[PDB]
């Protein structure tokens, strides 16, 4: 993908993304 490569900003509606459950634990530690 990296090889493939007034402004209207359109960011990804990232709320629908969900993490693995270990990833939830990791997010918890890094939030702490």
């Amino acid at each position: 993908m990296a090889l493939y490569n007034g402004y209207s900003p359109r960011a990804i509606d990232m709320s629908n993304v969900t993490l693995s459950r270990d990833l939830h634990a990791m997010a918890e530690m890094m939030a702490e």
Partner: protein, 34 residues
């Protein structure tokens, strides 16, 4: 502007499936089954 005569004489049918962002596309399969 579609051709009305072509639309009436055609037999092709179409449906689409929108996979929402955040869902893994590799896990999603689309097509027909019997």
């Amino acid at each position: 502007r579609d051709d009305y005569d072509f639309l009436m004489q055609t037999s092709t049918y179409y449906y689409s499936v929108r996979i929402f962002p955040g869902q893994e596309p590799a896990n999603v399969w689309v097509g027909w089954i019997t």
